[PDB]
Amino acid sequence: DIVMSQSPSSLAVSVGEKVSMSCKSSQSLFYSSYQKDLLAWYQQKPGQSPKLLIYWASTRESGVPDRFTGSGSGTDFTLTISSVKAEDLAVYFCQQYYTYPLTFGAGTKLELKRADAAPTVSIFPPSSEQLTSGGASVVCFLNNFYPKDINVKWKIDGSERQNGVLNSWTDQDSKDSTYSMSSTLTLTKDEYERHNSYTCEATHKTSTSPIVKSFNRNE
C-alpha cells in the first residue's frame, strides 16, 4: 500500500505565522494524462467529519480561504497556511487517490503556542465511601501545564506500579492554552491498606527533576 507520512504530528502555532506541513508518499502520485498529482488535503475539527481543502495537490475547493496553498509534485507535498488564524486550529490530513486501497497520513495537529508551564500536582487518597464498598482509587491531578507531553509514574512504598493506572488528558484549554491530566491508580481495598506511602511523580520539560506528591495512608 502507498504509505503517506505526515510531519510534524503536532505543531504549535501563533496567529499570523506562516505554517507549513509535510506529507510524503512512498510512491509518486503524478498522473500524466491530467498533468496533476493525485493528492488531497483535509481539515478536521473535534466532533466533525473531515472537510476537503485541496485536490490534485494544489486546487482549493470552493469556499476554502485563499490563505491555504497546496504544493509539491511526485512524492513530497506541502500544505501552507500563509497567515494562520485561530479558526485554523484543527488536524490536517493528506490522502492519495493514485490507487486502491486509498490511504491517508496520520495527520498534523495545529495547537496554540504559549509559554512552557509546569503542572500543579495534587494527590487524593480513597474516600471512606469507596473503601466501604471494597475498592480503592488514588487520584493524581496534573493541572495547567504546557507543552502537552508529560509522564506520570506511580510508586507504592517506594516501588513503581504500572498495573491499575488509567490516565485522561484534556484538550488544549480554550482560554489559557494549557493542558491538564488526571492519573488514577485503582487497587483493592485489601492491597491499598497493606501499603503506606503513595506517590505520584510528574516528569515534564519544565523541570530537570520530577514533581512529587505523596501521602502516607496512616497519616
**Contact positions vs other proteins (CB under 8 A):** 31, 33-34, 38, 40, 42, 49-52, 55, 61, 93, 95, 97-107, 120, 122-127, 129-130, 133, 135, 137, 139, 141, 143, 166-170, 180-182, 184, 186, 213-215
The smaller minimum CB distance to other proteins, of residues 80 and 169, is found at: 169
For residues 202, 158, 131 and 126, what is the CA-based torsion angle, rounded to 10 degrees? Answer: -20
State in Å, rounded, how far the first CA of the chain is from the last one.
59
Q: Compute the least distance from the CB of residue 104 to other proteins, in Å.
A: 4
- Closest CA relative to residue 155, chosen from 204, 203, 118, 117: 203
The smaller minimum CB distance to other proteins, of residues 83 and 127, is found at: 127
Q: Compute the least distance from the CB of residue 108 to other proteins, in Å.
A: 11
- Are 34 and 124 in contact, with CB atoms under 8 Å apart? no
The smaller minimum CB distance to other proteins, of residues 182 and 203, is found at: 182
Q: Compute the least distance from the CB of residue 80 to other proteins, in Å.
A: 19
The smaller minimum CB distance to other proteins, of residues 83 and 132, is found at: 132
Q: Compute the least distance from the CB of residue 144 to other proteins, in Å.
A: 8
The smaller minimum CB distance to other proteins, of residues 17 and 61, is found at: 61
Q: In what order do the strands lie in the sheet with 19-25?
A: 4-7, 19-25, 76-81, 68-73
Q: Compute the least distance from the CB of residue 157 to other proteins, in Å.
A: 17
Strands (E) across 62-218 are located at 68-73, 76-81, 91-96, 103-104, 108-112, 120-124, 135-145, 151-156, 159-161, 165-169, 179-188, 197-203, 211-216
